[PDB]
Amino acid sequence: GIQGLAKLIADVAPSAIRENDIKSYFGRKVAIDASMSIYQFLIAVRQGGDVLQNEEGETTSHLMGMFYRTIRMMENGIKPVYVFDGKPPQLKSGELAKRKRLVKVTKQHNDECKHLLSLMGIPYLDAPSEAEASCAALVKAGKVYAAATEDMDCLTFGSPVLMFHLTASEAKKLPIQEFHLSRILQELGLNQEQFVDLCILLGSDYCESIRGIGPKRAVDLIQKHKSIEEIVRRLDPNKYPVPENWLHKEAHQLFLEPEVLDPESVELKWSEPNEEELIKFMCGEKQFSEERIRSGVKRLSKSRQKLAAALEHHHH
DNA sequence: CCCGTCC
DNA sequence: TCCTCTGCCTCAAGACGGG
DNA sequence: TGAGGCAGAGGAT
């Protein structure tokens, strides 16, 4: 994401953040970065220091998390579409390349979660590149109400609305924090292109940031000079030298014109979970408790009925 | 609440 | 002297409930 | 990985 962007918005554009009761979201569609969720589950869902697993050692922490987080959302009337990352851009790979077993999401984790989601009737999409960019595209085209993510990248990708820390709001019984991009730009007095340059200065996954430039300086410089190139000419090279081989022009273009899925091609449905196949998969292969799975499918089934009744005469 | 299980 | 940033550290990132 | 709480070294004023 963007280093410190969340903190900055709260401190400088407080009106861009609204708190709404969770009831008021009943019926709404949200886009979710599924690769980011799998990673959180692999890291946090542990016992004795190891992931949950079946007898033969296959990882199940990610299925555990995806199954119950998704059902909890549906019970609050929030309808998720999961976006899976595609091949990362060159800059992301290059920046990672420049930078206790280390957790990593594999194609196998993705495929297993895709298989679970299909048996649950939960829609998912494959982004051609960055999932957050495609999430932004779904919000922009009106296919979902918001991206539900902790990665402020979506904002840099133009997502008009972002639901921040949704699952912690659910677990702790707190209102949901909604970020409104337009309000951000209005409070900072910036346009989207200037915001992207600011985000790069704060620190992005695509490229390096100027050493000695942090949140306070970057806001002031972007407001007066309006672009990174105009800033670098005015900056004193002895005091604040830029990093060599700086790829900010390239990172700017990635944020402005990301490869994204076509949102008009997207068909979205939340269909009846397949209880018998879920049992064979989660219990027969993954050794989840059958009593717990059945209970989760029943809650998900009942969730669909309430969503359908609430939305039948109120299409979105 | 505290902290262990889930697989 | 004050403001701003950087390093270093530490922690928690899930969902849920039994006791 | 990031994000909050502190330490302190600079340039900022």
**Who's near A119: CB < 8 A, 6+ residues apart?**
A273, A274, A277, A278, A281
Phi-psi region of A297 (alpha: psi -120 to 50; beta: other; left: phi over 0): alpha
Cβ count within 10 A of residue A246: 16
* Alpha-helical runs (H) found in A76-106: 90-98
Q: What is the resolution of this structure in A?
A: 2.3
Cβ count within 10 A of residue A245: 8
Nearest-CA neighbor of A22 among A87, A82, A77, A100? A77
Which residue is listed with tokens 């495929």?
Answer: A111
- Side-chain-side CA neighbours of A38 within 13 Å: the count stands at 24
Q: How far apart are CA A131 and CA A151, in angstroms?
A: 11
Total domains present in chain A:
1
Helix A215-225 with A192-202: angle, nearest 10 deg: 150
Helix A5-12 with A192-202: angle, nearest 10 deg: 120
CB A125 within 8 Å of CB A83? yes
Nearest-CA neighbor of A32 among A142, A139, A147? A147
Rg of the Cα atoms in chain A: 21
Check the annotation: does A205 bind a ligand.
Answer: yes
Check the annotation: does A233 bind a ligand.
Answer: no
Nearest-CA neighbor of A80 among A107, A109, A52, A113? A113
- Type of residue found at A174: L
Which residue gives the smallest C-alpha to C1' distance to B4?
A: A47
Q: List, in sequence order, every beta strand (DSSP E) within A194-248.
A: none
Give phi and psi for A160, each to the nearest 5.
Answer: -65, -30
Q: How far apart are CA A169 and CA A159, in angstroms?
A: 21
Q: How far apart are CA A284 and CA A279, in angstroms?
A: 6
Structure tokens that stand for A235 in this block: 């900056």
Check the annotation: does A33 bind a ligand.
Answer: yes
Which nucleotide has its C1' atom closest to residue A99's CA? D1
Interface residues for strand B (CB within 7 Å) are A 45-47, 52-54, 60, 64, 286-289, 292
Instruction: Report how far Cα A37 is from the mean position of its chain's Cα atoms.
Output: 8
CB A259 within 8 Å of CB A126? no
Domain range for residue A195?
A: 1-316
Separation in Å: D10 C1' and A242 CA: 18
Partners of residue A82 on adjacent β-strands: A32, A124
Check the annotation: does A132 bind a ligand.
Answer: yes
Q: How far apart are CA A61 and CA A47, in angstroms?
A: 10
Strand D: list positions under 7 Å from protein Cβ.
2-4, 11-12
Separation in Å: C3 C1' and A21 CA: 38
CB A28 within 8 Å of CB A310? no
